[PDB]
RNA sequence: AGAACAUGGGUGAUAAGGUCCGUGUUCGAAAGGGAAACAGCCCAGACCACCAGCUAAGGUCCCAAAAUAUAUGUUAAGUGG
RNA sequence: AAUGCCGGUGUGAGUAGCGAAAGACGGGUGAGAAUCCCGUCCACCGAUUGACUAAGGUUUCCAGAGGAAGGCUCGUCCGCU
RNA sequence: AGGUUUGGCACCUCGAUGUCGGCUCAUCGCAUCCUGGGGCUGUAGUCGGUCCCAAGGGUUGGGCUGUUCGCCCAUUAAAGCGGUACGCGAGCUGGGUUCAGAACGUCGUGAGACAGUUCGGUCCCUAUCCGUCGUGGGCGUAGGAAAUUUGAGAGGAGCUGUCCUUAGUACGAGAGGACCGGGAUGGACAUACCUCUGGUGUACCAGUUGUCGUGCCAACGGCAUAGCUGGGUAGCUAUGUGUGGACGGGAUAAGUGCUGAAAGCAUCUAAGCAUGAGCCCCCCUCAAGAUGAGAUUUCCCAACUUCGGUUAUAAGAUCCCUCAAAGAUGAUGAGGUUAAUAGGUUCGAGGUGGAAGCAUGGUGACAUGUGGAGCUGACGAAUACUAAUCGAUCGAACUUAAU
């Protein structure tokens, strides 16, 4: 469950180790967000180089909260950690490595260009 | 139009003359009757007096009623 | 937070209308006795 | 207890197929995926945590990390996406629930066998 | 159109064909019987009024609800039936079937109906303001005096007195509720009881009505 | 410590239930009838009794006394061009 | 009729409150016992709610009798008579 | 001209009408922010400009300032403008300002002042009446009762956004881009159920463990926040699971439409002539005969009577076990069968291997069952053992018409 004022771990490659999200993007006084999601959000910590850098003011979307979601079957996927993709809002990742596993609710968020790059979709 | 209001916050009701004649036209006589007699408590008993019918048939045979024409 | 005017007999004795004891039971003790609390445990003057 | 016509009318739904599992077990579950149309099977390997419930609505929890991130996958005993359960292990343990494991590297503070 | 009646029994739980979690109520509706047929001509308005649980004889020194009284003792002789614990009437049927005396199967209703369910709320007791209408409860520190109270009850000397309806602490509830749009999942006639999709008014082994959804 | 009203004027903005003079009335210190209610507006000044009569101002379909009165006309709207 | 002075009696009302603090059961005395006496358990203070010593107070100290008032309930008890 | 927001006046209140912003909770208006209808364009086309009609419902999260107001960051369909003692302090706070301390500046011979700053500075009340939200007692209603109801009349619910045709057609010498049709779709808010699933908590549930004092080893019990740590039954719950929502009918407002004269040409109107919404009503949910009068089914008095009333009647209170109900009353489940409550016996579910004996091992410890054992609260079943198992109280005329 990602407020505002979350910090959110950030798993690809750009200069990106840490962001602070700024707005849940969706309805009106809608509060949280989950896997699916998209914030909006700002870089915290970065590393030297990269396109993003710190200050930056950017798109992302939620791969893998610790309050894992509900399947239908009655089914479970928690994880360990909070994490995020930053996007370039064309549906595509604006790095060009994924770190981590990445549920499949992204296929049906339709989120497919992130689901090939990364390792053990669940 | 007719107006009620039934105490609580914005409910003012209404009702039109014609439609009410339409619907319930016994109402529409006996409410300008009885607005047209004292509201004493023998006035409210006074206006118990009243039978009001649509259409002409009634039951009161057994008292004997006898018609009465208007003498304006 | 205070009476704003007294109170007087009329109110007064009105509002003590339900301030009353209720009779107790007045039934006859079973096995033996006499009017009792109903279906007592009954041992005044009796035997339940 | 529940009642009787609770046990009766859902009676036929439990699968009378799967082993004995005791928390502390490795196992590994091969659940049915599907798609356009191919029923492709995936496997998950993992230490059981948790066991709650009775009747039809039982519930298990296996861990796995396999990538860096530990994950969690819970879902019901008698829920017909699974092909089989396969036991890969017994591992002894004290608890019932084995919820003692901030988690990252190895630093999964748990105890194995 | 079509309604049985009740008494619900708990939740559980059924997997849907194609691979589903559906959670469900348990309605046993067993001993039903139509007891009379009230019709326009005589009633001014058509219905029929049915009994779901028997009760015991008409016993001499008999005084909790468990055995009927000489009214009700006679009544439902006429329609060739034992004493009953509930009598509800329904007129959103169709008077014209409906034998009185007739026996009222829980296979009327089939798998894939679209239903109402109605009941009796749980009864939560006297509850203020934040329980029964959802308030705010201001701060709880910052040298704070108001907790769970409710705000202000109106405005100032100009209309100087409450309003109906202000909302104010009471008993929470009791009452009629019913829930729309809900939908049999399984028929059970062996055991005589339905499954419905979803979650029902009032406590367990409390009395439901069950109907063909108006809408 | 005065007040409203109508008429004559100043001040103010051809404002004020404003303020300042002049000529009257009424309230103050005045009960009664009318204006729904309503010191100052209209009629009228209560020594005491009466289940007598004539009138004022205002009124006469019901509330609520008295014309659903006459004869003869307007109105169709109900209460800058 | 002076938010007059003194006395008596209301209303609010059977309402607010009864001043931090372990008690249970058995037996006894009594017109009357949760409350007094006697147990056997159990809890509390535990550098003190322990033992002295002051100032200060002035018979409150002991025994037998008593329950009108006092004791925020009761009382057969008492620093009360 | 219309409505009264900086001012004019001094009519109520100085034997007190006591407070600016913010918090909590509202209720009205329309002079409309969004959604809904329409039309105009110097609208190529989307864009747009521009108007009129429309008041049901909605109308946000932060950074800075005590702030009203104000500038900024992100969203959203949208982030309107007003009244109500500039709504609401016997509902809240107390940052600003009118209090006693102190520093600075300016101006005063000085005591002091300014209106400039800055730090620090005690927010009382047990609700009588009316009002409001809940829940009872009394009486009533032409025989008394028990159960089902009808509905005059009340209250509550009408809001929104994505992906798909259409369509790349209209149109675009270029780059740019019309409107319009179906099911659906799965969403955001806010409503009202409920605990099967994920989770929370559980103070008479099982386990591990540290100090100390008692019965002297150990095993128990006491106190250390429930001593602490790890799990967790039923009940109660959200962050969990279900469900609803313009509207499911046409029809009306500037507007768009038809035929047609004074004014013989002309004319959306003049008589006539149809529509276009959020308009109606419908619908949907709940309560409802103290609606001072409306039913239907069954039961009971065959008397007694001066049927004025009495006893028996149908039936309800009294009392006692209780909970699915509960401040208390009330409302349900029960009272000698029987399963209301308790014990006992079995489950379920919880937590996880008791003792005694054996086998070790130097010993701390392990094994290991012919031991998923022993323990177990509120869950469930069955059961006569302990109990609700006796008995009194209260209670049954006028009139026409027939037949």
Do not use: W
């Amino acid at each position: 469950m990602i407020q505002q004022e979350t910090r959110l771990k950030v798993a690809d490659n750009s200069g990106a180790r840490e962001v602070l999200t700024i707005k849940v993007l969706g309805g009106s006084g809608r509060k949280t967000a989950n896997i699916g999601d998209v914030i909006v959000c700002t870089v915290k910590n970065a590393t030297p180089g990269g396109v993003v850098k710190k200050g930056d003011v950017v798109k992302a979307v939620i791969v893998r909260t610790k309050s894992g979601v509900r399947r239908n079957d009655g089914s479970y996927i928690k994880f360990d950690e909070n994490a995020c993709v930053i996007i370039r809002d064309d549906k595509g990742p604006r790095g060009t490595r994924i770190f981590g596993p990445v549920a499949r609710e992204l296929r049906e968020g339709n989120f497919m260009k992130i689901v090939s790059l990364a390792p053990e979709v669940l | 139009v007719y107006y009620r209001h039934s105490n609580h916050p914005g409910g003012i009701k209404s009702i039109t003359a014609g439609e009410l004649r339409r619907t319930n036209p016994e109402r529409l006589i006996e409410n300008s009757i009885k607005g047209m007699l004292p509201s004493t408590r023998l006035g409210e008993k006074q206006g118990k007096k009243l039978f009001v019918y649509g259409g002409a048939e009634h039951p009161h045979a057994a008292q004997q009623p006898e018609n009465y024409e208007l003498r304006g | 937070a205070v009476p704003k005017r007294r109170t007087s007999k009329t109110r007064k004795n009105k509002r003590r209308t339900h301030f009353k004891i209720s009779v107790p039971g007045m039934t006859e003790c079973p096995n033996c006795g006499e009017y009792k609390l109903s279906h007592r445990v009954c041992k005044n003057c009796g035997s339940y | 207890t529940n009642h009787k016509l609770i046990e009766a009318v859902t009676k036929s739904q439990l699968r009378t197929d799967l082993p004995s599992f005791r928390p502390g077990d490795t196992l590994r579950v091969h659940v049915r995926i599907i798609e356009g149309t191919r029923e492709r099977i995936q496997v998950f390997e993992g230490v059981v945590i948790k066991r709650r419930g009775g009747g039809v609505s039982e519930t298990f929890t296996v861990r796995k990390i396999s990538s860096g991130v530990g994950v969690e996958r819970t879902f019901p005993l008698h829920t017909p996406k699974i092909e089989k359960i396969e036991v890969k292990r017994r591992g002894k343990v004290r608890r019932a629930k084995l919820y003692y494991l901030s988690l990252r590297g190895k630093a999964a503070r748990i105890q194995e066998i | 159109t079509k309604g049985i009646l009740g008494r619900k029994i708990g939740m559980t739980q059924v997997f849907g064909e194609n691979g589903e979690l559906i959670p469900v109520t348990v309605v046993e509706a067993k001993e039903n019987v139509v007891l009379q047929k009230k019709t326009v001509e005589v009633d001014g308005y058509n219905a029929i009024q049915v009994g779901f649980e028997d009760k015991k004889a008409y016993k001499k020194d008999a005084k909790s609800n468990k055995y009927a009284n000489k009214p009700a003792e006679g009544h439902a002789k006429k329609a060739d039936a034992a004493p009953k614990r509930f009598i509800r009437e329904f007129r959103n049927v169709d008077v014209d079937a409906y034998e009185v005396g007739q026996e009222v199967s829980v296979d009327t209703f089939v798998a894939g109906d679209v239903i109402d369910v109605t009941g009796v709320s749980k009864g939560k007791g006297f509850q203020g303001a934040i329980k029964r209408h959802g308030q705010s409860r201001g701060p709880m520190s910052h040298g704070s005096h108001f907790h769970r109270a409710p705000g202000s009850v109106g405005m100032a000397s100009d209309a100087s007195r409450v309003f109906k309806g202000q909302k104010m602490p009471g008993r929470m509830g009791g009452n009629t509720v019913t829930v729309q749009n809900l939908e049999v999942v399984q028929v059970d006639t062996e055991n005589k009881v339905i499954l419905v999709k979803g979650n029902v008014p009032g406590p367990k082994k409390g009395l439901v009505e069950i109907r063909t959804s108006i809408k």
